[PDB]
Design brief:
homodimer; 78 residues; alpha+beta; 3-stranded antiparallel beta sheet; 24% helix; 10% strand; globular; binds zinc ion; E3 ubiquitin-protein ligase XIAP (chains A, B); signaling protein/apoptosis; Zinc finger; signaling protein-apoptosis complex; dimeric
Chain lengths: 78, 78
């Protein structure tokens, strides 16, 4: 279901507009919005990432927190 | 957008598995998959490279076709 980026993007309703990282960027990096604050969680490795700050890379933070995530490693590539 | 290696890697869905060079290696060398055959194109210098053969170096072929590419010269280094 969440293999599709659009389905991930739909979980971002009410995502804080004041966040330095956008909902589209986070969805692209494999994240789903948990609904609380700025906490997102990867559909694949289940790692959660929060406390986003200016200059952050959605993919960069994702790799840092979960270096062996299959999604980031291209496991779902058609 | 494509400055991020992962975004380049995502363009490789359906990239021929029989190719002597892998999608990850090509993405690392700054290439995006054009979707046709084994033709990839650099996000930075726009040079396209195809006809990959055993023993080929993704970065090597990239330099040969586009010696002044900013990406290969490290222009995007943080
Ligand atoms: Zn993950
Ligand atoms: Zn180039």
């Amino acid at each position: 279901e969440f293999v599709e980026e659009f389905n991930r993007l739909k979980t971002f309703a009410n995502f804080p507009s004041g966040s330095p990282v956008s909902a589209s960027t986070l969805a692209r990096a494999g994240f789903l919005y948990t609904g609380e604050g700025d906490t997102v969680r990867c559909f694949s490795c289940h790692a959660a990432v929060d406390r986003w700050q200016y200059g952050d890379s959605a993919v960069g933070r994702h790799r840092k927190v979960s270096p062996n995530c299959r999604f980031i490693n291209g496991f779902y590539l058609e």
